[PDB]
Amino acid sequence: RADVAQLTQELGTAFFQQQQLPAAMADTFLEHLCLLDIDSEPVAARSTSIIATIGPASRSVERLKEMIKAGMNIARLNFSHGSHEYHAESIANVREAVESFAGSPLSYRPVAIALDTKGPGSGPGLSEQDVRDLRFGVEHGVDIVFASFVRKASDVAAVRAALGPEGHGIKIISKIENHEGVKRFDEILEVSDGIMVARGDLGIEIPAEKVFLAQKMMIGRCNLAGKPVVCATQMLESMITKPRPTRAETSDVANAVLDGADCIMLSGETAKGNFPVEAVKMQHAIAREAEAAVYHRQLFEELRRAAPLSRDPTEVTAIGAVEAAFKCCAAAIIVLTTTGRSAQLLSRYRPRAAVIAVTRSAQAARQVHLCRGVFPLLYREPPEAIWADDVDRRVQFGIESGKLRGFLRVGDLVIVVTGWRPGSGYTNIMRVLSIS
Amino acid sequence: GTAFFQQQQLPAAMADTFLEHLCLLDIDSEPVAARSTSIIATIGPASRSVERLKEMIKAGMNIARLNFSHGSHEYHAESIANVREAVESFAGSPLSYRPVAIALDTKGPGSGPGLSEQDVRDLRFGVEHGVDIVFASFVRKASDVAAVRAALGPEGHGIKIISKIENHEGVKRFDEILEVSDGIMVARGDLGIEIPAEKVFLAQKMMIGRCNLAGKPVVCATQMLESMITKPRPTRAETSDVANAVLDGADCIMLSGETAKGNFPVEAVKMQHAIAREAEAAVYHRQLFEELRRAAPLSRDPTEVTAIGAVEAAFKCCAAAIIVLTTTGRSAQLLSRYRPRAAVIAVTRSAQAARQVHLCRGVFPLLYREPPEAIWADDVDRRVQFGIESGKLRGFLRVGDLVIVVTGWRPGSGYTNIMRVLSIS
Amino acid sequence: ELGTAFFQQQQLPAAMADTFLEHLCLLDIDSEPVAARSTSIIATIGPASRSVERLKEMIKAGMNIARLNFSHGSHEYHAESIANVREAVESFAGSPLSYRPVAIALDTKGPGPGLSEQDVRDLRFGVEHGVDIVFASFVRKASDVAAVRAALGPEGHGIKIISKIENHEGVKRFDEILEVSDGIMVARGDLGIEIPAEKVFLAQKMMIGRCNLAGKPVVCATQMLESMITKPRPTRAETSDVANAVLDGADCIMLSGETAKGNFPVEAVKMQHAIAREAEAAVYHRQLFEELRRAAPLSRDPTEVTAIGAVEAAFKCCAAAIIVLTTTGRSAQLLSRYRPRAAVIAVTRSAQAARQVHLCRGVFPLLYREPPEAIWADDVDRRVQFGIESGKLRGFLRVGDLVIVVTGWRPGSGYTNIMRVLSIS
Amino acid sequence: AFFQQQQLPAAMADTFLEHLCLLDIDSEPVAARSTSIIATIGPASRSVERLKEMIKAGMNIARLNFSHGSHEYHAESIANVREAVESFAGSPLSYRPVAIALDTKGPGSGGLSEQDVRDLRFGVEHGVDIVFASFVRKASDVAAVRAALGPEGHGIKIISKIENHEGVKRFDEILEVSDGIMVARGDLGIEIPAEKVFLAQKMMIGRCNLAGKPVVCATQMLESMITKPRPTRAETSDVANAVLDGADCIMLSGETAKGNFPVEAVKMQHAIAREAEAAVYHRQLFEELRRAAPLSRDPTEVTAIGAVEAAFKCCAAAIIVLTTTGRSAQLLSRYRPRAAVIAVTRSAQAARQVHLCRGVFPLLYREPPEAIWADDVDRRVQFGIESGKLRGFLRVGDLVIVVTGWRPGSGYTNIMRVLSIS
């Protein structure tokens, strides 16, 4: 109690009852479980991103606006169904719904567009249809590709090649859907930007009772690697027809978050279901509760010991900033990023503080939704003559956006992470600031 | 051998951290140990057939639940009889006979405050018909448990009371309820309506953890494999749910509509068996045992002291089983609370105790039917040999295996105090 | 059941701490030691401690092992010392429940490349005179231990070889030396000349830790209470040194000139006794036993499995003692390696084993001289009660206390497999 | 080759038992000696030429025992020490500051004695940096010493000597009002049983480490070196164990004040401390210090833990911190980093007083303030790099953590930077 006594007198006894704080202060995992309280409300913003599959039930511009308000971060286009003309209309409807909020840049929410490929099917390499669908994604500016049935590192190289020179910035999330993919996992993850645990096909290729081992191992290996991991298929399946999910479904969503999944997905739930906005609201509600129940004491310590020593200033500054954020119960970590890399390196250490990422890249702002706990802000202002002043304006943009969105209150402490010179890869500074 | 250390997630359990443990989980690592989490199957039209109950017993059913919300007393007496007929059809081979507990799930107080009039009549029925367990519905305070204990009368003293926590008051008064109950049931169906649906997993995880700490059984209930009522295979969320209830530390898992009225009752039991076996191998025993050890308070009870010594000994030699003689099941329960990887093979002459130990994870009851030998230590050895022969026949033991034998210094319950290291010959 | 006063003594609040930093902060100088002194005291016999009457005073002060330095004195001189020690020890053998055995150790002169001619003659002398231990000087490699082992003629294979690590070669070849030795001695005198004086503490701490991991005795030797040769009280560095050797994990502590030629031989023994008692209470058993537990490999030896089960059981009930029946001292040694807080009362019929177990920390030997009983189980029982009766008489046990009893299933060495939880009546 | 030195295999161990087993006598210490050495000044160590040798041997703090000698005697000692220290001021990149500490006579049979009030006023008039207040029994005793220093003796550090049973029992109230503690084992070994002193030492060191306040281990550390050129096996063990316990400072009383080998006793304490610091199990030490330290909303406190964590991640050669009062360097020190805390200060008093904190290497900056504050900071950081390069702490290619503030004055430390040397 001596390690909380002073901050208890300062922040109050009511602060330390919320967001499962008594449970996270526990010395053991058994004590942590015993200290979980249903009356302990989550205060932090929802960090696990929600991928919603776009279909007939969620294609209208007006419906898409409701899903954005409900918590949709990434829009998935399943290229197994629909024509190129159909998917181009979906992309346009999504962009129209997202840009309807651009009038207020302090409260604008970027939404990523992901292309889920049909797959190789009976074939060995990349199918002819996949090459055409990938060329479509490049021409239409998709941010992510969920490459279906990845079975080796050569499969991911084929997808990167089909994207061409212009599709270099697109993120490749390899869907592990069969036994070969599970066995060659380490070689696949090495060449991928992240992974997707495609439980539907995986539950047919391997025994249904073994899928949870594959999900847990893949999530843990992705967490170790610092790369995003998506949990997919049948998460809230009953919500396709019913307004409330089963006890197994709510348990499943919460357990995917507890395992360490960066993203959670809705397939039929939002693409063809009667309750698409309600499925997004439900995933948001469960994720918020599950994230508070994460045992950060052992999680951070294990992530820290497992991570190898590094001489990269971005990597060093990231662990220093996350450690600083935990020490003062920082409301947020504000980071300036160009490619999203600095925000990704903060994210891998799983801080309780929100990683508010300020970027000028619209693509990077959409793609950082793949990383848990990263809240992107798109800076639209033109560059100042003095670089040091341009940096200060972006930091103030992050504070004003964070104050307006409820992340920051006056009196709160924030960690600011910046670089010494412009251009990607020079992040090396950490500042402790008091919100005034 | 090298082959032994690749099975039952042994590389994953040897890991120094939980993150390393997760990364070392192998889908090609097959489970070796017997399924420890017991399966409760609700009895209804789909599962009352004597021939069907035999198939469910073979599939892995350990406890038969009678839902007193549906049916008359005449209906439930026919269920009890059909279950007993199916269970006793295997009594001809005592080395492979599997005891099955009968549990009475009460209707509940509903609008009322105390124990309803129907519940008092249903509880008296349970006593008259020899039920082993009671799942008392909508327990809100310790006085509710006392009312159930009182309705059971003097003859229902041996019956176990598992308090169903189905509402917010029960979740808040949990500590006082668990103190007076024999165990708990996380009744997720009503709980998911009384409290926000998105908070039920916190209540499940807290209750399971508190029960694990207390050394009392905890059942995870409702909608575990719901789609198996109509479909031959479950959803990805359903298999995940079953596995996560086992990983959380649930002693029992339950089937309601999946076995009461569904099209796949035997298939539902086989599925819960298959998932539990996988999930139990994936349990991180290194931290689990260490935390259970540290958390458990000091004790001057020889049964309690012998239990921790035996579990520690079982871990040191990778014991295939811990064979314990128990009259009331208590010795077996105290071994179980430390979550050993070794099976707790419990030999008992009490048919009621043999049925009731299914509530404790990892306890495999054996009913000894032979009459007592004149020389006590000879009778004790015959029981230990019965446990070895049963374990050999059922696949738990092989020649060359090491086994921990837990016994007492004199006849009668409460005198366990000895732990022996034995080599299977 | 024990009281608030029990939990304030023997640094019990400090041992319950969750961290080592918290453990240090909870050390109380007002917390008095209750347990008996476990770290054994080796006293060098010389002109200052050779008389039968002086030896009786040193036995009463706490001397467990008598060291004969073969660097000084003739074979006739050392034979008279052996006879005087045996006469002083047997003067108390009329009251067998309270009789204390004392080991005799021969410290060799030293090598030259191989075993010297004088060492071969001195080792033959040790065998002919029934010495229990040999402190082999300047061991540099495993071949040196084999030469001493070979020199312990045909009769002396039972003698324990404690390898003195006195130079850089011994420190580097440590693993191969410890593998073939019965234990080690950190001979700091010569080691402080062969290697930089400021590096000796690293060698001491590494060697003690490796011996603790191996389960073999480790002696801390030279200049522990050097000022007590001339002065009646030691320096602040000397008391700190003795306490830190105990805290590091040393099984034995030694007095060279302090006892052999000094002015205060009985006072140096009393001082080492006083400091060791304090230091043992301050040991952080929570992390010590958990690390010893994890570091020790899995074993399929019933003696090794029973030992960890018994120490775990002893800790759970705060057992006053662990009574182990041993013939070679092995079972007591395996209990000792897990560093229990309970005294290991070892009952043996071997006078040599009774003397040699003083090398193991926390082992209190009892030589049992009684005529054997016709029924082996009754003979087992008489020795267990002999251990309790002696324990009661010496202050280790009271009626109501809990004890752990380790025995085997059949007579003869190497069959230890039972652990019983007994209440002292 | 880097990973075989400074007990790096032993520090990477998953358990403390494995850590002990991995200690290598052939693993040489590379880092600079962090535990500061206090040397008592007497007849054997009073000459200006003798003092210069002790400064070169490793003396960081000079103790004046006011139990022996007159005010005129001690003023001559102060002057001789200052003359010996300032003889090296010609090269500011290699100049070593030396603190002057006044050890009071004590209350004896008696509150604060009349002689102590006179000796404390002497210390103020002569600019002493530290006071070792003898026989502190309660918090009111510390308040009496603070009062006897007056309005001129505000910046003086008070190290309370715990020498009796009452002081050990009232420890928490004494430490709360003191700047640090001294485990005065000589009198403590007479007031309490000799066999219980190690419990008091270990508890006090641990409580000081938890509090983030300096702790000195004192008396009979190398006692045999008063007459002999080499210490006993118990003495080398004792010095090493005081460092291993977590003592910020180690002391030499008769060993330097009246002993035949004063320079040799300083060299011996330096040699043992260097070895003992490498053998510190940082894995569990840092983790326990981190968990035990309470949450803080002070940016200096938050930046300190962030910087130490960053230093461990890259195996930083040093942490360079810009400090006015020594507080920022003290907060880095409490987390026991393996990287040297190179503290750049303009205060000469602060530079002398940071020797009380383990691992802090003070540098006195003697250049005038620049017009642009941004450039004045960069010059002090470069002074720290050049001093560190010259003194062997840094090489080109090494990584350093730089800790600065956002605005001048004390208490505004809030920035951490990862820098690559040259």
Ligand SMILES: O=S(=O)(NCc1ccc(Cc2ccc(O)c(O)c2)cc1)c1ccc(O)c(O)c1
């Ligand atoms: O040993 S266990 O199986 N699991 C322990 C554990 C430890 C750390 C974390 C946080 C975490 C979460 C995800 C991670 O990938 C990761 O590195 C750390 C979770 C669980 C266990 C289960 C139930 C109990 O009651 C109990 O005492 C022990």
Ligand SMILES: O=S(=O)(NCc1ccc(Cc2ccc(O)c(O)c2)cc1)c1ccc(O)c(O)c1
């Ligand atoms: O129980 S023990 O005495 N504690 C070990 C321990 C652990 C960490 C540190 C470093 C440390 C960490 C944090 C501190 O605050 C601090 O003062 C020191 C030192 C000692 C022990 C355990 C296992 C053994 O094999 C053994 O010989 C002894």
Ligand SMILES: O=P(O)(O)OC[C@H]1O[C@](O)(COP(=O)(O)O)[C@@H](O)[C@@H]1O
């Ligand atoms: O995350 P990335 O891709 O490394 O971008 C972080 C970059 O942001 C900065 O803080 C400023 O970026 P820009 O000037 O390019 O907009 C750099 O110092 C740093 O290199």
Ligand SMILES: O=P(O)(O)OC[C@H]1O[C@](O)(COP(=O)(O)O)[C@@H](O)[C@@H]1O
């Ligand atoms: O677990 P319980 O019910 O306490 O039963 C343990 C008891 O069983 C025994 O092992 C065997 O005794 P019985 O011969 O009465 O069955 C007793 O020695 C011990 O007291």
Ligand SMILES: O=P(O)(O)OC[C@H]1O[C@](O)(COP(=O)(O)O)[C@@H](O)[C@@H]1O
């Ligand atoms: O410690 P040791 O040398 O292995 O001997 C222990 C032996 O002592 C016993 O407990 C009793 O046997 P004895 O009667 O022959 O002494 C054995 O059963 C056990 O094997």
Ligand SMILES: O=P(O)(O)OC[C@H]1O[C@](O)(COP(=O)(O)O)[C@@H](O)[C@@H]1O
């Ligand atoms: O150690 P202290 O007393 O807190 O002072 C640290 C100070 O060092 C600085 O980095 C530089 O200080 P000055 O400019 O006053 O010399 C400040 O920003 C900070 O306030």
Ligand SMILES: O=C([O-])C(=O)[O-]
């Ligand atoms: O493609 C998918 O999402 C799957 O197979 O689960």
Ligand SMILES: O=C([O-])C(=O)[O-]
């Ligand atoms: O009775 C039950 O199992 C429920 O309500 O969930």
Ligand SMILES: O=C([O-])C(=O)[O-]
């Ligand atoms: O012989 C010894 O013990 C020594 O040299 O230290």
Ligand SMILES: O=C([O-])C(=O)[O-]
């Ligand atoms: O004054 C002191 O330092 C002592 O007595 O040890």
Ligand SMILES: [K+]
């Ligand atoms: K698809």
Ligand SMILES: [K+]
């Ligand atoms: K019911």
Ligand SMILES: [K+]
């Ligand atoms: K000798």
Ligand SMILES: [K+]
């Ligand atoms: K003095």
Ligand SMILES: [Mg+2]
């Ligand atoms: Mg698929």
Ligand SMILES: [Mg+2]
């Ligand atoms: Mg209900």
